[PDB]
Design a protein around this ligand. Structure first.
Ligand SMILES: Nc1nc2c(ncn2[C@@H]2O[C@H](COP(=O)(O)OP(=O)(O)OP(=O)(O)O)[C@@H](O)[C@H]2O)c(=O)[nH]1
Lengths: 201, 348, 80
């Protein structure tokens, strides 16, 4: 739109920058380039997972508050894991994992379902049919489902940082409302199996 | 990294850490920290404090100090995020090991602002009341200290509206219990015990020490308002007037220490940390001379020692962070600022 | 008054505090020598503290000025 079609997006991995590969590098050097965005940075303390998480939880363009709340939740999970470590015996501490980043990644990739339901038109009735979903679709769905099950009017009093920290610690090993409704989605697929033939794509 | 001599300290080895005892946590200073750092050390489960150059210089001042001189006044000031108040708590620890009567307040922002119920006092006139905070600080001082209360031996009496009185030769533990039993006249009880501390001018049985955090709140206007929608001056408040009339350098038997804090400063701009700027004209007129102590950012080696402390504590679970580029970007984005350093290592 | 006189003067204003701050120490440190106030104000360290207070309170303060003021107070109170 704004940027001319000649411009392309650059990559970020300085480890990939610093050293046919040289042929494509020469082609990129000949080609033009636009300005990098403000969100992404080549620092080691960042990843597209938390980038998308911030961009999703943010409302009204309050990225500062979104990221402050994200780091508050990371701290909450870290302190919970540290109390687990301090209370647990040596053999159980050897098993307990404390990294909140890996905890979040595990919870997300356990909540992610590999199949979804698509509404398909038949006659005058729309029917749900199982369909395999792409990776980005599954990631977005899992993230939004986690966030929407975290924030809810049922816990209007208690605060979203600790709420979603507890929800993440629950889903870390396939527990919580997200996990239970994922199982229910799998059950709905098992119910709507035979309608698979309705899809043409 | 770690230090085996917590009480005594030296300049040779800087950036070191010394462990402290749980009784020293709960008895000496159970209140005089920010709740963030209180919970942060609770989650540590291992209380270790770091040495600081201005802290050691202030300790040198205390070591080379005569009490025949007038009561000296120290003011700690940083850049809104340094270790001024933590070094003040270090001084509190040192003096408690020296066995002095230390009275330390959590903050004066809480006093001047956020009172749930501001009252025509009966012990005086033209004075509101701070009953809840009075009783709070009263039980706080009780928890902080006991033989001192038992042996204070106030040489004067005090009547009360509660059909009762207190006579000579009695320990002020009884007025402490009075204020803890009923909170209405706890403000008068506090404003009377503070005067009684100085009523003993000899101070041979103990040595008095005053410890103040957020001194900027002591000099400045109030956010409160009168029920008729009229502002309230700071000097009108009971505790404000009492403290102002009280700390004067008239007891001349030691030192008093105060620290500045802009995070809670009211009616003041951000990124303002100069002493004169914070305490204003009225502050300079209240104490023209004093010992200013600039609490600068972390030094390089002290910063690496703190990193090593965090690594021994396994605080950073990101195991790719302990590397040259990670440390470089970390201290570059931190600029050796202790508070943002704590925040970063917290959420990393 | 001082509120009207925006440039304070070292005539009585700071002297009110300096008399107390000096005699409170002279009663014990000086052993009741009863040194005259003008004789005390004619010293060098008192003039250095005067000019320090001038440079600090009148115009913008800086790190070097605050360090000079600290050294002034230290030399005045001889506490080290
Ligand atoms: N372990 C250790 N941490 C320190 C030290 N000095 C500063 N810090 C860190 O820096 C933070 C700031 O210290 P504080 O004294 O509480 O900050 P402050 O004086 O209240 O600053 P403001 O109120 O914002 O003006 C602390 O919570 C610590 O995490 C130190 O000497 N040892």
């Amino acid at each position: 739109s704004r940027y001319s079609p000649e411009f392309k997006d650059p990559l970020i991995d300085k480890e990939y920058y610093r050293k046919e590969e040289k042929y494509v590098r020469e082609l990129k050097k000949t080609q033009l380039i636009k300005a990098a965005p403000a969100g992404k940075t080549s620092s080691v303390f960042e990843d597209p997972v938390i980038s998308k998480f911030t961009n999703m939880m943010m409302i009204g363009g309050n990225k500062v508050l979104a990221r402050s709340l994200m780091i508050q939740t990371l701290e909450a999970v870290k302190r919970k894991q540290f109390e687990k470590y301090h209370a647990a015996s040596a053999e159980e501490q050897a098993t307990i994992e404390r990294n909140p980043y890996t905890i979040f990644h595990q919870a997300l990739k356990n909540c992610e379902p590999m199949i979804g339901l698509v509404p398909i038109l038949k006659g005058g009735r729309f029917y749900q049919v199982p369909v395999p979903l792409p990776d980005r679709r599954r990631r977005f769905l899992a993230m939004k489902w986690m966030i929407t099950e975290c924030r809810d009017k049922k816990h209007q009093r208690t605060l979203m940082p600790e709420k979603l920290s507890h929800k993440l610690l629950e889903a870390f090993h396939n527990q919580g409302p997200v996990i239970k409704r994922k199982h229910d989605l799998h059950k709905m697929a098992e119910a709507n199996r035979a309608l698979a033939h309705y899809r043409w794509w | 990294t770690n230090e085996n001599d917590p009480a005594k300290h030296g300049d040779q080895h800087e950036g070191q850490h010394y462990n402290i005892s749980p009784q020293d946590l709960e008895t000496v200073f159970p209140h005089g920290l920010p709740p963030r750092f209180v919970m942060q050390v609770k989650t540590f489960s291992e209380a270790c404090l770091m040495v600081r150059k201005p802290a050691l210089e202030l300790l040198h001042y205390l070591k080379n100090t005569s009490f025949a001189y007038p009561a000296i006044r120290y003011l700690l000031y940083g850049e809104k995020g340094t270790g001024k108040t933590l070094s003040l708590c270090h001084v509190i620890h040192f003096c408690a090991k020296q066995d002095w009567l230390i009275l330390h307040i959590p903050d004066a922002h809480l006093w001047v602002k956020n009172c749930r119920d501001l009252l025509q006092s009966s012990y005086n006139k033209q004075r509101f009341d701070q009953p809840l905070e009075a009783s709070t600080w009263l039980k706080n001082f009780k928890t902080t200290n006991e033989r001192f209360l038992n042996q204070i031996k106030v040489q004067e009496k005090y009547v009360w509206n509660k059909r009762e009185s207190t006579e000579k030769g009695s320990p002020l533990g009884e007025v402490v219990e009075q204020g803890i039993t009923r909170v209405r006249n706890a403000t008068d009880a506090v404003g009377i015990v503070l005067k009684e501390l100085k009523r003993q001018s000899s101070l041979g049985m103990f040595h008095l020490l005053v410890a103040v955090d957020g001194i900027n709140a002591l000099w400045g206007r109030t956010t409160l308002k009168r029920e008729d929608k009229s502002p309230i001056a700071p000097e009108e408040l009971a505790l404000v007037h009492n403290l102002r009339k009280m700390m004067k350098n008239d007891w001349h038997g030691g030192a008093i220490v105060s620290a500045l804090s802009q995070t809670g400063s009211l009616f003041k701009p951000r990124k303002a940390y100069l002493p004169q700027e914070l305490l204003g004209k009225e502050g300079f007129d209240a104490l023209d001379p004093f010992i200013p102590i600039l609490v600068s950012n972390y030094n390089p080696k002290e910063f690496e020692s703190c990193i090593q402390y965090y690594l021994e504590n396994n605080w950073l679970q990101h195991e790719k962070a302990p590397t040259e580029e990670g440390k470089k970007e970390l201290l570059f984005l931190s600029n050796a600022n202790p508070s943002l350093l704590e925040r970063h290592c917290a959420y990393l | 008054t001082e509120a009207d006189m925006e440039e304070y003067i070292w005539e009585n204003s700071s002297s009110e505090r300096n008399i107390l701050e000096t005699l409170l120490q002279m009663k014990a440190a000086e052993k009741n020598m009863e040194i005259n106030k003008e004789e005390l104000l004619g010293t060098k360290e008192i003039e250095e503290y005067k000019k320090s207070v001038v440079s600090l309170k009148n115009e913008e303060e800086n790190e070097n000025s605050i360090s000079q003021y600290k050294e002034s107070v230290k030399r005045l109170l001889n506490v080290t």
